[PDB]
Design a protein around this ligand. Structure first.
Ligand SMILES: Nc1ncnc2c1ncn2[C@@H]1O[C@H](COP(=O)(O)OP(=O)(O)NP(=O)(O)O)[C@@H](O)[C@H]1O
Ligand SMILES: [Mg+2]
Ligand SMILES: [Mg+2]
Lengths: 317, 684, 181
């Protein structure tokens, strides 16, 4: 699973995280997280380890094995847990959800004792991680984004749209950047370069990006810092180019016939490999590999029973 | 004031103006009311100063002449204004009543009350009796003595009004309350002979009838099984069974008590002896034996009482079965000025309603020959609901004060509430009262429609819907709602109507009732009322509410499946509303009700202050949240905020249409609905 | 059974209002004559004797006989009814036929196929002409529930004014303007 670079991690409500080759549609193995549904997935840059966030669990598994046995394993807080994330240096994992307290759980630990706590606003909807050892992005249900330093609980608060909750926020490569989407989904992009002190600086408003969104679900970046993508709660995904943040292309899973309409919401997006391919998913149990600047749907994976959501995938070994 | 507000630099000026107006026309009630209210508002402002400085006793003592310099004339002006008006005077009386209850240790207030309460008609004091018997002879003699004097004074004119409240009060566990009840009841028996004793007999018989020994033992043995088998709390189990064992030891008084002893008591005594032997010897095998016996008794009683349908009065109350022309006012009555209805007799048996809870349907025949129906029930705190009905009466009077709400008949449907001692009493049965959930079930059954279709669609998409995130839930919920047509009640509204004209009138009354109740629900703190508690009239189609629960803004504290919005207008309701939906009639009614609330905000604040202030009821608000008195003050502040347009925009002033639209937009938040409890069936 | 049609076909020969009342009476009597229930076959003679018993029992006998009649015979009786409705403006006959339509709409058997769209146009118009303004409002709302149309919205405004309820007219106008220009 973890030894094959083009594997895509997919999961839905049906308590199974499947792993299937992006370019062929062939499933290799599965993982069981019967505690609850998937609220989020993640494939570590550590090469390799699985994370799956759901209600009262951050279940961490061994991505390399054909049987990814549990790692720590959480068994987290007694409230709903929404987000995940692995640091690029083999460092701590980061846990969100309700209550307003971001938990920090080491990868090397083998018990439930937390290593650090960070202060946040209304329950965390998303977490993303810089290559920097002292920067971390969180998006909350309050409409507020939060930077913290990973070491000292020094933090910066941002609120680009206070009356509109933020659901997904991510980075760009070359360290200090930020992008985010909210309950309107009109994406925002800032540059975070840079500094650590009593407040973690500096937010630089760069641009606003008009995703065709009535409620946005996930926004992510490319490893090469050339592309951005967003997903609407209605039936579409969109792709921009980072150099100018102007619309490259789109995916429309809404058929012309009304009978097939409302097949599902577009849950999750991100890019893999070169600046040509993109991985997304829908709640009709269909995980999709399609193309950048082209809109051509290449592979479709109907291997799940209940509402695929929030994909994750490997990119290299 | 409209240019300056109320403050230390403005109080004496406006008081001088109001006093000059009083001197120009001393017969003008409005000027006297203005002067007394301005003194009360000055008392409130200097109280705000007192709380600002004291919270950061000397300041209170220093203001104990400043506050008296307004409180004493506030109390006196309220007395004179009350003597100059009737009906609405109770509002002014309430302004007195709360005020000195807060200031009931200063002697000048005592002198003013002792000389001024004689300027009030006793018939209007009759409307105050519950909050008098709540504070009679408590640890504050300056208040308790005056309250005892007032209740004795009431006893000299209308003892019948005091017999029931004092009969209930005498069963209070507090020594002072019981003894004060004894004194006032003797002072009343000087006039009424043994009617106190007859009422006590009736109350005790009804209390015993309300819960059988079978039912008391059912609850007690359920708790005992839980503690010994679930918690393994042997001591707690014995504590629970101790008064229950005592009741069984005391022996029976009626045929069902004797029958219980013949059937269950003989075995329950053996289990009792096994428990007693454990508690001095440590035989856990004896505990197992006694517990298994209690288990069998519990299951036998549970299987015995679905037949609790026809409860014959002979076997639970021979005294009441042979009821005669007792000179006791029928419960739910009376107007003192009118031919009070005396109790002639009652039906030979009672009809019990089958549910988790088991009220008795009582029927009574009075002096005028009419029938009166009631719902006796235990395990139920009815003082809360009695105050809620007083508040409904307040709101109805406010609407009756508005010509728009007189030509357009807006009113909250009211019914009886008659608490009895030991958390029980008679509620009252309302005819033609149909559960909305039952109406939807009726439509679906008559057309062979499966009832759980919407929930089944939800679970087909998400068998584990509960542990989903907000957007996951919204996806599943909106797909299901699109996959159904929640318009059953509109079809029943059309079908049950004899003609188009009756349908039109019923729809109009329906929509007006929905608007009025939604606005009143937001303002008074609506929340925990499932569709089961939401009733409909067969004739008018106006909406009724039987359960009041925790609807005092504290039910919003719920976190396990809330109650995120104080009020709701569901899809089914809008489907039965007019073509316009909100537009036209509904929005107009909501605006009118909010205007009435804003204009008479002072009265609503005073009455909710009366409810929140009383310690007996205020202590029950600790079940939910927070320094209880400080949270009470905060609650009254939030009430003022809602009544001043400061709930959505606190640091602003919401206009009536602005606040109405904000409330509507809150109610439109389907994202909140997905999180809420499925008892409020969110697909309708 | 078929005799009931023979009086119904008499609708092709009535002009005056008294003639239409006679037509309704004779149809009522013949419906009572061959009613499925013997309780009405017995009351046929009394209905001939008095007259208003035919009127009161017209709905009851009509429902049973119309149920017994087959598809073509039902359509023939319906065409007779439609001739009566579209021929003359009589409050009594029209209201009786509207009452039949109301019962059949309410009853599970389905409405009378009086004309296209169940005559919801004609019925509504007749409900306006017989001063049953709420009845016409109901028919216009049946039209509305298929979709908002400027004519339907304006008709609802007019009927609401006719019902002395300016509130409903104002709300309907606001809905019309927000939905379309
Ligand atoms: N005025 C009333 N009129 C008709 N039926 C009533 C009335 N009040 C209650 N009921 C009916 O009897 C049942 C309610 O019984 P009840 O024991 O009062 O509920 P409850 O759960 O104890 N309320 P609460 O204790 O406040 O949470 C329901 O089935 C009602 O239909
Ligand atoms: Mg109860
Ligand atoms: Mg009750």
């Amino acid at each position: 699973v973890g030894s094959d670079p083009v594997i895509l991690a997919t999961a839905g409500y049906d308590h199974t995280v499947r792993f299937w080759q992006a370019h062929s549609g062939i499933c290799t193995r599965t993982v069981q997280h019967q505690d609850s549904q998937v609220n989020a997935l993640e494939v570590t840059p550590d090469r390799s380890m699985i994370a799956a966030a759901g209600y009262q669990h951050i279940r961490m598994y061994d991505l390399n094995s054909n049987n990814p046995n549990p790692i720590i394993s959480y068994d987290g807080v007694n409230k709903n847990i929404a987000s995940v994330g692995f640091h690029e240096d083999g460092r701590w994992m980061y846990t969100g959800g309700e209550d307003c307290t971001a938990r920090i759980w080491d990868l090397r630990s083998r018990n439930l004792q937390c290593q650090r706590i960070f202060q946040v606003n209304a329950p965390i909807n998303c977490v993303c991680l810089h290559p920097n050892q002292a920067e971390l992005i969180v998006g909350d249900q309050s409409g507020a984004i939060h930077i913290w330093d990973l070491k000292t609980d020094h933090n910066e608060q941002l609120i680009p749209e206070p009356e509109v909750s933020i659901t997904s926020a991510h980075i760009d490569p070359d360290a200090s950047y930020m992008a985010a989407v909210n309950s309107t989904g009109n994406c925002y992009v800032w540059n975070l370069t840079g500094g650590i002190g009593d407040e973690v600086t500096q937010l630089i408003p760069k641009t606003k990006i008009p995703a065709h969104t009535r409620y946005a679900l996930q926004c992510r970046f490319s490893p090469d810092s050339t592309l951005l993508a967003t997903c609407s709660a209605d039936q579409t995904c969109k792709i921009w180019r980072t150099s100018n943040f102007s619309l490259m292309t789109e995916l429309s899973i809404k058929s012309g016939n009304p009978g097939e309409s409302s097949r599902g919401w577009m849950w999750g997006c991100a890019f893999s490999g070169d600046s040509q391919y993109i991985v997304t998913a829908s709640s009709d149990n269909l995980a999709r590999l399609w193309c950048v600047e082209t809109g051509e749907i290449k592979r479709e994976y109907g291997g799940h029973q209940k509402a695929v959501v929030c994909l994750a995938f490997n990119d290299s070994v | 004031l409209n240019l300056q507000g109320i403050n230390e630099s403005t109080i004496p000026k406006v008081l001088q103006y109001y006093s000059a107006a009083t001197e120009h026309d001393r017969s003008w009630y409005k000027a006297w009311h203005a002067w007394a209210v301005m003194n009360f508002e000055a008392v409130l402002h200097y109280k705000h100063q007192n709380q600002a400085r004291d919270e950061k006793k000397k300041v209170t003592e220093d203001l104990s002449k400043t506050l008296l310099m307004y409180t004493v004339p506030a109390v006196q002006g309220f007395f004179r204004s009350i003597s100059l008006s009737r009906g609405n005077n109770l509002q002014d009386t309430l302004r007195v009543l709360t005020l000195w209850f807060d200031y009931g240790h200063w002697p000048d207030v005592n002198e003013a009350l002792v000389e001024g309460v004689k300027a009030i008609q006793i018939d209007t004091w009759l409307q105050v009796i519950p909050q008098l018997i709540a504070r009679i002879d408590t640890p504050r003699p300056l208040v308790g003595r005056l309250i005892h004097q007032l209740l004795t004074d009431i006893g000299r004119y209308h003892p019948q009004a005091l017999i029931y409240p004092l009969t209930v009060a005498s069963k209070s566990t507090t020594t002072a309350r019981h003894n004060a009840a004894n004194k006032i009841l003797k002072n009343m028996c000087e006039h009424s002979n043994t009617l106190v004793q007859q009422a006590m007999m009736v109350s005790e018989e009804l209390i015993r009838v309300a819960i059988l020994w079978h039912e008391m033992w059912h609850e007690g043995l359920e708790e005992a099984s839980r503690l010994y088998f679930g918690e393994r709390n042997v001591k707690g189990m014995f504590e629970v069974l101790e008064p229950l064992h005592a009741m069984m030891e005391r022996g029976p008084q009626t045929l069902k008590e004797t029958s219980f002893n013949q059937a269950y008591g003989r075995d329950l005594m053996e289990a009792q002896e096994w428990c007693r032997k454990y508690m001095k010897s440590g035989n856990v095998k004896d505990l197992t034996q006694a517990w298994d016996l209690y288990y069998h008794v519990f299951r036998r009683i549970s299987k015995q009482l679905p037949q609790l349908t026809s409860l014959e009065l002979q076997y639970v109350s021979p005294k009441l079965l042979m009821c005669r022309d007792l000179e006791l006012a029928v419960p739910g009555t009376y107007d003192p000025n009118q031919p009070i209805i005396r109790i002639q007799s009652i039906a030979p048996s009672l009809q019990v309603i089958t549910s988790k809870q088991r009220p008795r349907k009582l029927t009574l025949m009075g002096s005028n020959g009419h029938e009166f129906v009631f719902l006796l029930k235990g395990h139920e705190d009815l003082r809360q609901d009695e105050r809620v009905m007083q508040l409904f009466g307040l709101v109805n009077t406010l609407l009756a004060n508005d010509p728009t709400s007189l030509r357009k008949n807006l009113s909250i449907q009211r019914y009886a509430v008659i608490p009895l001692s030991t958390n029980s009493g008679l509620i009252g049965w309302v005819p033609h009262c149909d559960t909305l959930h039952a109406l939807i079930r009726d439509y679906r059954e008559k057309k062979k429609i499966l009832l759980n279709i919407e929930h089944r669609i939800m679970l087909r998409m998400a068998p584990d819907y509960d542990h989903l995130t907000l957007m996951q839930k919204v996806e599943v919920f909106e797909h299901a709602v699109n996959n159904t047509a929640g318009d059953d009640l509109a079809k029943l509204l059309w079908l049950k109507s004899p003609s188009s004209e009756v349908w039109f009138d019923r729809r109009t009354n329906y929509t007006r009732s929905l608007a009025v109740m939604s606005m009143v629900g937001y303002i008074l703190g609506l929340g925990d009322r499932h569709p089961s508690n939401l009733m409909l009239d067969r004739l008018s189609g106006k909406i009724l509410h039987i359960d009041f629960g925790d609807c005092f803004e504290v039910a919003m504290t719920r976190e396990k499946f809330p109650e995120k919005i104080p009020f709701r207008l569901t899809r089914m309701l809008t489907n039965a509303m007019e073509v316009t939906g909100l537009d036209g009639n509904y929005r107009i009614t909501c605006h009118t009700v909010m205007e009435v609330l804003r204009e008479h905000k002072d009265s609503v604040m005073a009455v909710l202050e009366a409810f929140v202030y009383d310690p007996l009821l205020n202590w029950r608000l600790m079940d939910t949240n927070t320094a209880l008195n400080k949270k009470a003050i905060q609650i009254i502040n939030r009430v003022r905020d809602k009544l001043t347009g400061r709930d959505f925009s606190h640091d602003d002033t919401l206009d009536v249409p602005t606040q109405v639209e904000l409330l509507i937009k809150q109610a439109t938040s389907h994202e909140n609905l997905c999180q809420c409890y499925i008892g409020w069936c969110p697909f309708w | 059974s078929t005799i009931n049609l023979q009086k119904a076909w008499g609708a092709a020969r009535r002009v005056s209002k008294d003639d239409w009342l006679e037509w309704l009476r004779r149809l009522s009597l013949e419906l009572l004559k061959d009613s499925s229930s013997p309780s009405l076959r017995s009351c046929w003679a009394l209905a001939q004797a008095y007259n208003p018993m035919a009127r009161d029992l017209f709905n009851a006998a009509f429902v049973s006989c119309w149920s017994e009649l087959n598809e073509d015979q039902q359509d023939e009786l319906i065409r007779s009814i439609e001739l009566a409705l579209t021929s003359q403006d009589i409050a009594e006959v029209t209201q009786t036929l509207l009452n039949l339509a109301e019962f059949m709409e309410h009853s599970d058997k389905g409405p009378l196929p009086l004309r296209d769209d169940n005559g919801i146009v004609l019925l509504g118009e007749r409900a306006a002409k017989c001063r049953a303004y709420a009845k016409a409002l109901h028919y216009k709302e049946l039209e509305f529930q298929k979709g908002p149309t400027p004519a339907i919205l304006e008709s609802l405004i007019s009927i609401n004014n006719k019902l002395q309820q300016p509130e409903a007219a104002a709300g309907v106008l606001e809905y019309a303007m927000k939905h379309f220009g």
